[PDB]
Design an enzyme around this catalytic site. Structure first.
Site, PDB file in Angstrom:
ATOM      1  N   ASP A 121      11.214   4.412 -16.694  1.00 56.62           N
ATOM      2  CA  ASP A 121      10.932   3.084 -16.214  1.00 56.62           C
ATOM      3  C   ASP A 121      11.950   2.107 -16.824  1.00 56.62           C
ATOM      4  N   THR A 159       8.123  -1.887 -10.441  1.00 55.38           N
ATOM      5  CA  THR A 159       7.807  -0.496 -10.730  1.00 55.38           C
ATOM      6  C   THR A 159       7.107   0.249  -9.613  1.00 55.38           C
ATOM      7  N   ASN A 180       4.039  -5.425  -7.335  1.00 58.48           N
ATOM      8  CA  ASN A 180       3.131  -5.017  -8.395  1.00 58.48           C
ATOM      9  C   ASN A 180       1.790  -5.803  -8.254  1.00 58.48           C
ATOM     10  N   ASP A 261      11.629   0.312 -20.193  1.00 53.45           N
ATOM     11  CA  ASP A 261      11.068  -0.919 -19.618  1.00 53.45           C
ATOM     12  C   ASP A 261      10.220  -1.709 -20.628  1.00 53.45           C
ATOM     13  N   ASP A 308      13.458   3.825 -11.959  1.00 53.80           N
ATOM     14  CA  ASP A 308      12.876   3.042 -10.881  1.00 53.80           C
ATOM     15  C   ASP A 308      13.658   1.738 -10.579  1.00 53.80           C
ATOM     16  N   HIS A 309      14.272   1.132 -11.601  1.00 56.73           N
ATOM     17  CA  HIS A 309      14.955  -0.183 -11.505  1.00 56.73           C
ATOM     18  C   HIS A 309      15.593  -0.402 -12.889  1.00 56.73           C
ATOM     19  N   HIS A 420      12.618  -7.918 -14.293  1.00 55.88           N
ATOM     20  CA  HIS A 420      13.282  -7.293 -13.135  1.00 55.88           C
ATOM     21  C   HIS A 420      12.453  -7.684 -11.950  1.00 55.88           C
ATOM     22  N   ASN A 684      10.008  -9.327  16.272  1.00 51.35           N
ATOM     23  CA  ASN A 684       8.807  -8.890  15.515  1.00 51.35           C
ATOM     24  C   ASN A 684       9.133  -8.368  14.091  1.00 51.35           C
ATOM     25  N   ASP A 686      10.535  -5.968  12.585  1.00 55.74           N
ATOM     26  CA  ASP A 686      10.193  -4.589  12.155  1.00 55.74           C
ATOM     27  C   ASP A 686      11.435  -3.755  11.845  1.00 55.74           C
TER      28      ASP A 686
HETATM   29  C1  LIG Z   1      10.900   3.564   8.166  1.00 54.50           C
HETATM   30  O1  LIG Z   1      10.309   4.876   8.382  1.00 54.50           O
HETATM   31  C2  LIG Z   1       8.974   4.768   8.969  1.00 54.50           C
HETATM   32  C3  LIG Z   1       8.363   6.151   9.167  1.00 54.50           C
HETATM   33  O2  LIG Z   1       9.094   6.847  10.182  1.00 54.50           O
HETATM   34  C4  LIG Z   1       8.977   3.957  10.261  1.00 54.50           C
HETATM   35  O3  LIG Z   1       7.596   3.540  10.418  1.00 54.50           O
HETATM   36  C5  LIG Z   1       6.981   4.073  11.577  1.00 54.50           C
HETATM   37  O4  LIG Z   1       7.397   3.345  12.715  1.00 54.50           O
HETATM   38  C6  LIG Z   1       6.769   3.670  13.993  1.00 54.50           C
HETATM   39  C7  LIG Z   1       7.143   2.622  15.084  1.00 54.50           C
HETATM   40  O5  LIG Z   1       6.775   1.273  14.660  1.00 54.50           O
HETATM   41  C8  LIG Z   1       5.240   3.693  13.812  1.00 54.50           C
HETATM   42  O6  LIG Z   1       4.686   4.202  15.042  1.00 54.50           O
HETATM   43  C9  LIG Z   1       3.402   3.591  15.383  1.00 54.50           C
HETATM   44  O7  LIG Z   1       2.326   4.336  14.778  1.00 54.50           O
HETATM   45  C10 LIG Z   1       0.973   4.063  15.203  1.00 54.50           C
HETATM   46  C11 LIG Z   1       0.059   5.073  14.486  1.00 54.50           C
HETATM   47  O8  LIG Z   1       0.181   4.793  13.078  1.00 54.50           O
HETATM   48  C12 LIG Z   1      -0.754   5.429  12.171  1.00 54.50           C
HETATM   49  O9  LIG Z   1      -0.495   6.838  11.946  1.00 54.50           O
HETATM   50  C13 LIG Z   1       0.725   7.151  11.224  1.00 54.50           C
HETATM   51  C14 LIG Z   1       0.962   8.672  11.137  1.00 54.50           C
HETATM   52  O10 LIG Z   1       0.100   9.339  10.197  1.00 54.50           O
HETATM   53  C15 LIG Z   1       0.698   6.455   9.851  1.00 54.50           C
HETATM   54  O11 LIG Z   1       1.892   6.724   9.097  1.00 54.50           O
HETATM   55  C16 LIG Z   1       0.558   4.933  10.022  1.00 54.50           C
HETATM   56  O12 LIG Z   1       0.588   4.267   8.722  1.00 54.50           O
HETATM   57  C17 LIG Z   1       0.777   2.820   8.776  1.00 54.50           C
HETATM   58  O13 LIG Z   1      -0.424   2.022   8.844  1.00 54.50           O
HETATM   59  C18 LIG Z   1      -1.284   2.173   7.704  1.00 54.50           C
HETATM   60  C19 LIG Z   1      -2.404   1.181   7.909  1.00 54.50           C
HETATM   61  O14 LIG Z   1      -3.217   1.773   8.910  1.00 54.50           O
HETATM   62  C20 LIG Z   1      -0.615   1.924   6.346  1.00 54.50           C
HETATM   63  O15 LIG Z   1      -1.420   2.417   5.267  1.00 54.50           O
HETATM   64  C21 LIG Z   1       0.764   2.569   6.236  1.00 54.50           C
HETATM   65  O16 LIG Z   1       1.394   1.970   5.068  1.00 54.50           O
HETATM   66  C22 LIG Z   1       1.558   2.338   7.537  1.00 54.50           C
HETATM   67  O17 LIG Z   1       1.789   0.910   7.658  1.00 54.50           O
HETATM   68  C23 LIG Z   1       3.111   0.567   8.169  1.00 54.50           C
HETATM   69  O18 LIG Z   1       3.282   0.844   9.597  1.00 54.50           O
HETATM   70  C24 LIG Z   1       2.423   0.067  10.486  1.00 54.50           C
HETATM   71  C25 LIG Z   1       2.627   0.444  11.978  1.00 54.50           C
HETATM   72  O19 LIG Z   1       2.117   1.769  12.327  1.00 54.50           O
HETATM   73  C26 LIG Z   1       2.662  -1.434  10.220  1.00 54.50           C
HETATM   74  O20 LIG Z   1       1.757  -2.212  11.004  1.00 54.50           O
HETATM   75  C27 LIG Z   1       2.508  -1.787   8.732  1.00 54.50           C
HETATM   76  O21 LIG Z   1       2.897  -3.132   8.484  1.00 54.50           O
HETATM   77  C28 LIG Z   1       3.379  -0.908   7.842  1.00 54.50           C
HETATM   78  O22 LIG Z   1       4.743  -1.258   8.107  1.00 54.50           O
HETATM   79  C29 LIG Z   1      -0.700   4.604  10.859  1.00 54.50           C
HETATM   80  O23 LIG Z   1      -1.881   4.774  10.052  1.00 54.50           O
HETATM   81  C30 LIG Z   1       0.850   4.130  16.732  1.00 54.50           C
HETATM   82  O24 LIG Z   1      -0.472   3.734  17.079  1.00 54.50           O
HETATM   83  C31 LIG Z   1       1.888   3.233  17.432  1.00 54.50           C
HETATM   84  O25 LIG Z   1       1.802   3.411  18.885  1.00 54.50           O
HETATM   85  C32 LIG Z   1       1.809   2.180  19.684  1.00 54.50           C
HETATM   86  O26 LIG Z   1       3.126   1.768  20.108  1.00 54.50           O
HETATM   87  C33 LIG Z   1       3.679   2.609  21.146  1.00 54.50           C
HETATM   88  C34 LIG Z   1       5.151   2.315  21.420  1.00 54.50           C
HETATM   89  O27 LIG Z   1       5.742   3.483  22.008  1.00 54.50           O
HETATM   90  C35 LIG Z   1       2.864   2.463  22.428  1.00 54.50           C
HETATM   91  O28 LIG Z   1       3.462   3.166  23.526  1.00 54.50           O
HETATM   92  C36 LIG Z   1       1.475   3.005  22.136  1.00 54.50           C
HETATM   93  O29 LIG Z   1       0.678   2.773  23.306  1.00 54.50           O
HETATM   94  C37 LIG Z   1       0.883   2.286  20.919  1.00 54.50           C
HETATM   95  O30 LIG Z   1       0.610   0.952  21.386  1.00 54.50           O
HETATM   96  C38 LIG Z   1      -0.777   0.574  21.391  1.00 54.50           C
HETATM   97  O31 LIG Z   1      -1.121  -0.061  20.146  1.00 54.50           O
HETATM   98  C39 LIG Z   1      -0.448  -1.307  19.887  1.00 54.50           C
HETATM   99  C40 LIG Z   1      -0.758  -1.801  18.463  1.00 54.50           C
HETATM  100  O32 LIG Z   1      -2.175  -1.942  18.238  1.00 54.50           O
HETATM  101  C41 LIG Z   1      -0.855  -2.291  20.989  1.00 54.50           C
HETATM  102  O33 LIG Z   1      -0.215  -3.562  20.828  1.00 54.50           O
HETATM  103  C42 LIG Z   1      -0.491  -1.756  22.382  1.00 54.50           C
HETATM  104  O34 LIG Z   1      -0.934  -2.724  23.355  1.00 54.50           O
HETATM  105  C43 LIG Z   1      -1.011  -0.311  22.629  1.00 54.50           C
HETATM  106  O35 LIG Z   1      -2.399  -0.220  23.014  1.00 54.50           O
HETATM  107  C44 LIG Z   1       3.312   3.547  16.907  1.00 54.50           C
HETATM  108  O36 LIG Z   1       3.794   4.833  17.343  1.00 54.50           O
HETATM  109  C45 LIG Z   1       4.789   4.542  12.606  1.00 54.50           C
HETATM  110  O37 LIG Z   1       3.378   4.469  12.342  1.00 54.50           O
HETATM  111  C46 LIG Z   1       5.463   4.015  11.342  1.00 54.50           C
HETATM  112  N1  LIG Z   1       5.051   4.819  10.183  1.00 54.50           N
HETATM  113  C47 LIG Z   1       4.931   4.366   8.926  1.00 54.50           C
HETATM  114  C48 LIG Z   1       4.525   5.378   7.858  1.00 54.50           C
HETATM  115  O38 LIG Z   1       5.169   3.197   8.613  1.00 54.50           O
HETATM  116  C49 LIG Z   1       9.786   2.683  10.157  1.00 54.50           C
HETATM  117  O39 LIG Z   1       9.966   2.107  11.463  1.00 54.50           O
HETATM  118  C50 LIG Z   1      11.142   2.937   9.489  1.00 54.50           C
HETATM  119  N2  LIG Z   1      11.782   1.660   9.333  1.00 54.50           N
HETATM  120  C51 LIG Z   1      13.035   1.435   9.809  1.00 54.50           C
HETATM  121  C52 LIG Z   1      13.562   0.039   9.639  1.00 54.50           C
HETATM  122  O40 LIG Z   1      13.687   2.276  10.409  1.00 54.50           O
HETATM  123  O1  LIG Z   2       0.468   4.456 -14.873  1.00 54.00           O
HETATM  124  C1  LIG Z   2       1.657   4.296 -14.653  1.00 54.00           C
HETATM  125  C2  LIG Z   2       2.506   5.472 -14.302  1.00 54.00           C
HETATM  126  C3  LIG Z   2       3.569   5.400 -13.414  1.00 54.00           C
HETATM  127  N1  LIG Z   2       4.187   6.474 -12.913  1.00 54.00           N
HETATM  128  C4  LIG Z   2       3.707   7.659 -13.314  1.00 54.00           C
HETATM  129  N2  LIG Z   2       4.320   8.744 -12.820  1.00 54.00           N
HETATM  130  C5  LIG Z   2       5.433   8.632 -11.881  1.00 54.00           C
HETATM  131  C6  LIG Z   2       4.982   8.398 -10.436  1.00 54.00           C
HETATM  132  C7  LIG Z   2       6.117   8.979  -9.635  1.00 54.00           C
HETATM  133  C8  LIG Z   2       6.488   8.751  -8.317  1.00 54.00           C
HETATM  134  C9  LIG Z   2       7.596   9.382  -7.781  1.00 54.00           C
HETATM  135  C10 LIG Z   2       8.312  10.249  -8.566  1.00 54.00           C
HETATM  136 CL1  LIG Z   2       9.690  11.070  -7.880  1.00 54.00          CL
HETATM  137  C11 LIG Z   2       7.963  10.497  -9.879  1.00 54.00           C
HETATM  138  C12 LIG Z   2       6.861   9.840 -10.419  1.00 54.00           C
HETATM  139  C13 LIG Z   2       6.264   9.919 -11.798  1.00 54.00           C
HETATM  140  N3  LIG Z   2       2.690   7.863 -14.167  1.00 54.00           N
HETATM  141  C14 LIG Z   2       2.103   6.757 -14.635  1.00 54.00           C
HETATM  142  N4  LIG Z   2       2.247   3.074 -14.718  1.00 54.00           N
HETATM  143  C15 LIG Z   2       3.379   2.400 -14.038  1.00 54.00           C
HETATM  144  C16 LIG Z   2       2.876   1.065 -14.617  1.00 54.00           C
HETATM  145  C17 LIG Z   2       1.621   1.778 -15.108  1.00 54.00           C
HETATM  146  C18 LIG Z   2       0.193   1.438 -14.646  1.00 54.00           C
HETATM  147  O2  LIG Z   2      -0.301   1.672 -15.991  1.00 54.00           O
HETATM  148  C19 LIG Z   2       1.049   1.582 -16.520  1.00 54.00           C
HETATM  149 CA   LIG Z   3       9.372  -0.072 -13.768  1.00 56.33          CA
HETATM  150 CA   LIG Z   4      11.797  -5.273  16.686  1.00 58.19          CA
HETATM  151 CL   LIG Z   5       5.106  -8.579  -7.087  1.00 52.47          CL
HETATM  152 ZN   LIG Z   6       8.941  -3.836 -16.210  1.00 54.61          ZN
END
Ligand SMILES: *[C@@H]1O[C@H](CO)[C@@H](O[C@@H]2O[C@H](CO)[C@@H](O[C@@H]3O[C@H](CO[C@H]4O[C@H](CO)[C@@H](O)[C@H](O[C@H]5O[C@H](CO)[C@@H](O)[C@H](O)[C@@H]5O[C@H]5O[C@H](CO)[C@@H](O)[C@H](O)[C@@H]5O)[C@@H]4O)[C@@H](O)[C@H](O[C@H]4O[C@H](CO)[C@@H](O)[C@H](O)[C@@H]4O[C@H]4O[C@H](CO)[C@@H](O)[C@H](O)[C@@H]4O)[C@@H]3O)[C@H](O)[C@H]2NC(C)=O)[C@H](O)[C@H]1NC(C)=O
Ligand SMILES: O=C(c1cnc(N[C@@H]2Cc3ccc(Cl)cc3C2)nc1)N1CCC12COC2
Ligand SMILES: [Ca+2]
Ligand SMILES: [Ca+2]
Ligand SMILES: [Cl-]
Ligand SMILES: [Zn+2]
Ligand SMILES: [K+]
Ligand code: NA
Length: 804
Positions: A121, A159, A180, A261, A308-309, A420, A684, A686
């Site tokens: 860290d 972190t 964080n 860190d 990490d940073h 940081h 949007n 994205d």
């Molecule tokens: C970086 O890499 C990543 C990973 O490849 C890229 O992100 C992907 O981008 C895809 C396109 O935007 C996106 O695809 C969508 O997924 C929807 C299903 O998503 C769920 O399932 C997946 C798979 O397991 C899961 O990973 C998702 O996780 C997200 O959401 C949860 C919360 O529920 C979070 O915990 C998680 O952190 C993650 O959040 C992030 O992504 C979401 C968007 O999914 C953001 O909103 C967050 O802010 C955050 O960034 C999900 O749990 C799927 O439903 C979508 O399909 C719609 O769109 C298509 C277009 O072709 C359409 O045809 C379909 O009909 C459908 O539309 C309908 O729904 C719309 C919305 O409600 C509605 O408006 C319409 O009218 C329709 O009815 C879509 O395919 C993919 O999920 C994410 N994956 C991740 C992990 O982020 C990213 O783009 C890369 N970045 C760059 C810059 O390149």
């Molecule tokens: O608690 C932890 C802590 C953090 N990180 C980890 N493990 C790392 C997770 C991780 C993710 C990706 C890879 Cl490749 C390696 C590792 C190891 N364990 C504890 N921290 C961070 C600040 C506090 C909260 O309280 C103190």
């Molecule tokens: Ca750190």
């Molecule tokens: Ca866009």
């Molecule tokens: Cl922060």
């Molecule tokens: Zn720190």
């Protein structure tokens, strides 16, 4: 409720976490106050410390001891890490000569080389040089293995965002750990460093490496360690897991250290007190390597040493206070420190106005050490907008500074000297990468790279298929001896049309005018230019591939080639080469307002001048600059309606300086350049190309969509003794994604000549080619003489404009 009356007997540092109310014996149980009653006694033994001594050698096994020096310890897997050194006359790993590891040298029954990630860290990149005298184990890893001069973290350089990015290959906006500290308005719940809510699984998106492994039948050690478990015990626990039977033994492990860190915050990055934390970390690396050597694993395991940073000098006195700018300071909530995020204190306050807050924070004091942004206006390279946990208003804080709401926040919380969190291009935020082992290269330096790339490589090292992520798989193949990933170029989805002359001038009623009513040698000559006779000079790396379904035309000209979209009524891309010898000229007076119909492209698929006349806010510019025409006759091509794009007058100041001054400057410095420029639409925020139905602004009264950004990709020969258009070897690139804004409020000195502020703006909005690819659905560098993995590396390069 924990029924802590169960026991950890035979369960110490169990890998599978057991469900409440059963008590836990895993490496995180302490953090949840959930360990069984006998966890400390059984699992955190300390008796007699961590090192064998001459007097303990061959001892009678006492199970109270922290580690063992008895004859049976090696087969039990619980020797002190220095056992063979003290008791069997062996050398420490660090004292052995480096010897190339050509193939894994593993014990029978190992299916694959294990991976151990040693994460530290706050380990700033420059520690590798500056602390080299006190870190001999780390320096051996670095010199014998594969290393980068530094590794770029993600923003914010905090972190949890960075550790989770390491785990997933995702930007924070996608994995959801955007700081964080966080508020999620959909859950109405807060995430903090202290306390319990952060353990809820709904915060953590994507698929971390340990889950990827498990789902594909590869066993994983638990990556997170409770703070109180001493480092020596984490190491001994890893070494014990490595001694498990084949069907139980993990293939992937992580160690984590809270140092340097923890000390860095107290003493600054180079405080004299920093030497001891660095020494101690090195000692821990030594314990791991001596431990692996005892188990005959030191030429079997792949080791990654990663941070990490970094850490910057930051003190209480370098704090800007929002109470010095805002009258309404009690109506906002600030996430403070090395970045700022602002939202309304109450969602019931209808008077709260982000526009008025932004304006009250913009260029108010001459040396102001933060800059406000609506999150969509942040540099695209940060990829910090597409998450509801990121507040609309963001403050980018200068390195070495903090922002806080009121002075009472800073003296009712000087203590600290380091912090940081700043912009991830800042030198002090850079961190480290070393890879050592059979799968990494030997004594090899690699260029700096981003931490988003490591998930794919870790997957490669373990034979896993990565989950979809933001790395570019293949771009780090040059780190690896074997297990390279061999990607194929994506297939072109839309093929271009190649229109000839199909329309008479009088079919156009665009409201455009040009004074251009002005020989068989040069009549054949210009026809050949229109059929693509100079295309080899201006399109050096092939045409870009269009990776989505659309209708577009390739247009050839003497000085430039373009891919013109019939849907967006403008080029997707415009490509041109400017040699070192090229001359800059002016736009002649007679051509000042000239726009010419393009007889290859229907009036219906063309822009029109009357829309620009009617739109009092919007003007226009050109993608291929008229300033750089090869000849007076060729200059007419630059005024085609098909080379026009919508530009706010404030942006035209930026664009015109770039085109008139900077392109030629780069061609002079780099021995010619090839430029590809174009529009971006990301309404949007994205990071991905908008479809037509996502566009929120048109030129008044028309179907001409307004770009959110303009890009350019500027490529030349890495060997600058060769001209860009006759380069035999590797390429050099710099790119930008400029926001297309109707004011220059971002640039506090914009009333001054463009030579005092434009280039600074452009550097802030530096980009990777890969960022542009996501934003446009285009794939570049399709036709080079270089390997595809090398081109992938090129596409991920970021020109940071930081000194060495
Ligand atoms: C970086 O890499 C990543 C990973 O490849 C890229 O992100 C992907 O981008 C895809 C396109 O935007 C996106 O695809 C969508 O997924 C929807 C299903 O998503 C769920 O399932 C997946 C798979 O397991 C899961 O990973 C998702 O996780 C997200 O959401 C949860 C919360 O529920 C979070 O915990 C998680 O952190 C993650 O959040 C992030 O992504 C979401 C968007 O999914 C953001 O909103 C967050 O802010 C955050 O960034 C999900 O749990 C799927 O439903 C979508 O399909 C719609 O769109 C298509 C277009 O072709 C359409 O045809 C379909 O009909 C459908 O539309 C309908 O729904 C719309 C919305 O409600 C509605 O408006 C319409 O009218 C329709 O009815 C879509 O395919 C993919 O999920 C994410 N994956 C991740 C992990 O982020 C990213 O783009 C890369 N970045 C760059 C810059 O390149
Ligand atoms: O608690 C932890 C802590 C953090 N990180 C980890 N493990 C790392 C997770 C991780 C993710 C990706 C890879 Cl490749 C390696 C590792 C190891 N364990 C504890 N921290 C961070 C600040 C506090 C909260 O309280 C103190
Ligand atoms: Ca750190
Ligand atoms: Ca866009
Ligand atoms: Cl922060
Ligand atoms: Zn720190
Ligand atoms: K106008
Ligand atoms: Na300004």
């Amino acid at each position: 409720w924990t029924a802590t009356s169960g026991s950890c007997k035979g369960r110490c540092f169990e890998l599978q976490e057991v469900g409440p109310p059963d008590c836990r014996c895993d490496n995180l149980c302490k953090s949840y106050s959930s360990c069984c009653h006998d966890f400390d006694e059984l699992c955190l033994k300390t008796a007699r410390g961590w090192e064998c001594t001459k007097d303990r050698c061959g001892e009678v096994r006492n199970e109270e001891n922290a580690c063992h020096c008895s004859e049976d310890c090696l087969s039990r897997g619980d020797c002190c890490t220095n056992y063979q050194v003290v008791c069997k006359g062996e050398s420490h790993w660090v004292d052995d000569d480096c010897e190339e590891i050509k193939v894994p040298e593993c014990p029978a029954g190992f299916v694959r080389p294990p991976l151990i990630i040693f994460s530290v860290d706050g380990f700033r990149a420059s520690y590798m040089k500056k602390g080299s005298k006190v870190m001999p184990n780390i320096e051996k890893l670095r010199s014998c293995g594969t290393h980068a001069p530094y590794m770029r973290p993600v923003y914010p350089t905090k972190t949890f965002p960075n550790l989770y990015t390491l785990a997933t290959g995702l930007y924070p906006e996608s994995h959801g750990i955007v700081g964080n500290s966080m508020y999620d308005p959909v859950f109405d719940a807060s995430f903090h460093l202290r306390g319990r809510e952060k353990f809820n699984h709904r915060w953590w998106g994507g698929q971390p490496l340990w889950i990827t492994a498990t789902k594909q039948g590869v066993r994983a050690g638990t990556f997170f360690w409770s703070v109180s478990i001493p480092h020596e015990r984490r190491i001994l626990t890893i070494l014990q897991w490595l001694s498990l039977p084949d069907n139980e033994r993990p293939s992937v492990y992580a160690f984590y250290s809270e140092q340097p860190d923890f000390s860095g915050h107290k003493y600054g990055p180079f405080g004299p007190e920093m030497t001891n934390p660095l020494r101690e970390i090195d000692k821990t690396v030594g314990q791991l390597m001596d431990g692996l050597k005892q188990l005959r694993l030191h030429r079997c395991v792949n080791v990654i040493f990663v941070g990490d940073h970094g850490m910057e000098d930051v003190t209480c006195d370098r704090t800007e206070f929002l109470s010095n700018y805002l009258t309404n300071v009690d109506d906002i909530t600030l996430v403070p420190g090395t970045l700022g995020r602002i939202r309304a204190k109450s969602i019931n306050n209808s008077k709260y106005d982000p526009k008025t807050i932004i304006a009250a924070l913009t260029c108010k004091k001459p040396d102001q050490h933060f800059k406000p942004y609506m999150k969509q206006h942040l540099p695209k390279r940060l990829h910090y907008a597409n998450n509801r946990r990121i507040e609309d208003i963001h403050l980018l804080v200068d390195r070495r500074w903090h922002v806080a709401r009121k002075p009472l926040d800073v003296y009712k919380k000087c203590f600290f000297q380091g912090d940081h969190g700043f912009d991830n291009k800042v030198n002090s935020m850079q961190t480290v990468f070393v890879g050592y082992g059979p799968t990494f290269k030997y004594r090899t330096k690699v260029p700096p790279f981003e931490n988003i790339e490591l998930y794919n490589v870790m997957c490669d090292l373990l034979g896993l298929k990565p989950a979809p992520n933001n790395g570019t798989h293949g771009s780090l193949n040059h780190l690896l001896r074997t297990n390279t990933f061999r990607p194929t170029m994506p297939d072109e989805v839309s093929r271009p049309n190649y229109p000839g002359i199909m329309y008479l001038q009088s079919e156009f009623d665009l409201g455009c005018t040009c004074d251009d009513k002005v020989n068989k040698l040069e009549e054949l000559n210009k026809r050949l230019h229109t059929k693509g006779s100079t295309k080899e000079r201006h399109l050096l790396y092939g045409r870009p591939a269009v990776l989505y379904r659309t209708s577009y035309d390739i247009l050839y000209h003497t000085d430039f080639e373009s891919g013109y979209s019939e849907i967006f009524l403008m080029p997707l891309w415009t490509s041109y080469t400017i040699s070192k010898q090229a001359e800059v000229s002016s736009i002649p007076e007679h051509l000042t307002n000239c726009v010419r119909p393009d007889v290859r492209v229907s009036p219906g698929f063309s822009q029109n001048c009357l829309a620009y006349k009617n739109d009092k806010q919007m003007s226009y510019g050109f993608l291929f600059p008229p300033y750089l025409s090869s000849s007076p006759e060729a200059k007419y091509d630059a005024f085609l309606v098909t080379n026009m794009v919508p530009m706010y007058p404030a942006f035209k100041r930026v664009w015109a300086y770039f085109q008139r001054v900077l392109v030629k400057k780069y061609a002079s410095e780099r021995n010619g350049v090839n430029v590809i420029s174009g529009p971006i639409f990301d309404y949007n925020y994205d990071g991905l190309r908008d479809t037509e139905d996502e566009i929120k602004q048109y030129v008044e009264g028309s179907s001409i969509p307004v770009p959110t950004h303009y890009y350019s990709i500027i490529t030349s020969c890495l060997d600058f003794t060769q001209p860009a258009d006759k380069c035999d070897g590797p390429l050099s690139v710099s790119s930008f994604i400029l926001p297309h804004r109707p004011d220059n409020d971002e640039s506090c000195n914009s009333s001054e000549d463009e030579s005092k502020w434009v280039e600074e703006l452009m550097k802030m909005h530096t980009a990777r080619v890969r960022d542009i690819e996501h934003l446009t659905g285009l794939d570049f560098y399709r036709k080079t003489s270089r390997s595809y993995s090398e081109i992938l590396t090129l596409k991920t390069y970021l020109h940071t404009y930081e000194s060495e």
